[PDB]
């Protein structure tokens, strides 16, 4: 049996640039204002959730540095022309920031002319807004911290763009990519703040420092080698053993 044990936490800030809405009262527009009320009902549910103030300690620390003034201005300006930026915070730590969605552009570019409409334009908006309806729906029930990191918290195409830029080894990027659903089950999404037209939540990916070492099951527990010593449930999959630091049916 091989191995894939966790040693640290990879912290990162995921942002979804929102857009301010002004006065909008003015058949095809019947469905526009209905998906518009869901966007209003979703952004207010995030702010009311924010009103309330030890496994993910390294991740939540960033969520309390974002509350500082001007820090949002650092991130909102970093993701000006692209969707991936690294910023040295007040603590001097450089965190990686990725702008997943750009609702700030889609609303001021396509809805200012009509409101202030083709039926084709209404279709795509319901999908871009539905993700916010779901991210809010998930953050509202798990009380700010969701796990595993779902598709809405970070899609399949966006978790890979993060693992590729992850300052880790080369083959482990090949390991985590083939076992993305396991990486998600060992991750944490942490809702942070809502202000200055930015929706940011801290995503915490697992760091696997121990790979391809012998391990054996069955004292009801697992045993994995680790620097000449052996440690102690672990999510197993095929020949790979995934675990972290604290009926042998079918046959193959």
């Amino acid at each position, epitope marked *: 049996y091989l191995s894939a044990l966790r040693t640290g936490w990879y912290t990162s800030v995921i942002t979804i640039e929102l857009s301010n809405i002004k006065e909008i009262k003015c058949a095809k527009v019947k469905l526009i204002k209905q998906e518009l009320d869901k966007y209003k009902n979703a952004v207010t549910e995030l702010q009311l959730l924010m009103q309330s103030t030890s496994a993910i300690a390294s991740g939540v620390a960033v969520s309390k540095v974002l509350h500082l003034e001007g820090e949002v201005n650092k991130i909102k300006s970093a993701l000006l022309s692209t969707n991936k930026a690294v910023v040295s915070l007040s603590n001097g730590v450089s965190v990686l920031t990725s702008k997943v969605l750009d609702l700030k552009n889609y609303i001021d570019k396509q809805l200012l002319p009509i409101v202030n409409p083709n039926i084709e334009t209404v279709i795509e908006f319901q999908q871009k807004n539905n993700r916010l309806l779901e991210i809010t729906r998930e953050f509202s029930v798990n009380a700010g911290v969701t796990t595993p990191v779902s598709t809405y918290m970070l899609t399949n195409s966006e978790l890979l763009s993060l693992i590729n830029d992850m300052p880790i080894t080369n083959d482990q990027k*090949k390991l985590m990519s083939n076992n993305v659903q396991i990486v998600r089950q060992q991750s944490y999404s942490i809702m942070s703040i809502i202000k200055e037209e930015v929706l940011a939540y801290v995503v915490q990916l697992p760091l696997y420092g121990v790979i*391809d070492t012998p391990c054996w099951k069955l004292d009801r527990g697992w045993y994995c080698d680790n620097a000449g010593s052996v440690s102690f449930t672990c999510k197993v999959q095929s020949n790979r053993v995934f675990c972290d630091t604290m009926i042998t049916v079918n046959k193959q």
Partner: antibody
Amino acid sequence: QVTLRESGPALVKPTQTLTLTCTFSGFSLSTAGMSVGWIRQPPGKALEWLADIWWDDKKHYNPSLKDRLTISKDTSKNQVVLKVTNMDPADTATYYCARDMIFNFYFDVWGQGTTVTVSS
Amino acid sequence: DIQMTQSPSTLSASVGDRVTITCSASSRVGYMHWYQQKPGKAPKLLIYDTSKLASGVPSRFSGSGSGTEFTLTISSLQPDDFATYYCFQGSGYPFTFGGGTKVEIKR
């Protein structure tokens, strides 16, 4: 299926820039995990990796050719452009491009390959 | 970096003879791959991930190995196997290939 084909000048005048373009179909580079690499082979010698690009515009070059290599993608055209400045009598090689995925670090699908000979 | 040493450099055997290529690396490498290049043609992926076999290739080819040593074993040689085989690593940058084993048929 996946297809690749190189395109460029077969004869180079020494030190003149060499623009090589690899068009691909059957897959979109914009899809996450996708990549496109470049491999050359001088006559009589073995293969040699050159560079590669990824969907997130992350670039990795070979330290053997540090200054001259410059790669760039083009999702809107399903092609990858590679510029090699200052060509030299030793750079005669059969240049190939290939697709790469983060799920498996190698080049599975290949192209026919173009011959570029470096001579006045 | 990671340098490759492929042996033998040139081997000759008859049709149906077991042939194994040994390709060692400098540092510890997780996965090893193999390629086949017919004369003039572009290479073709034979063995991927040390032991697994790629599609479009008969089960005649097999590989094994881990760490700093890897082998590619041909069960029974065939006249259509005349080519130059390489061992490629994708565990670290820069990407490096093997030395180059050119196999000839015994006739």
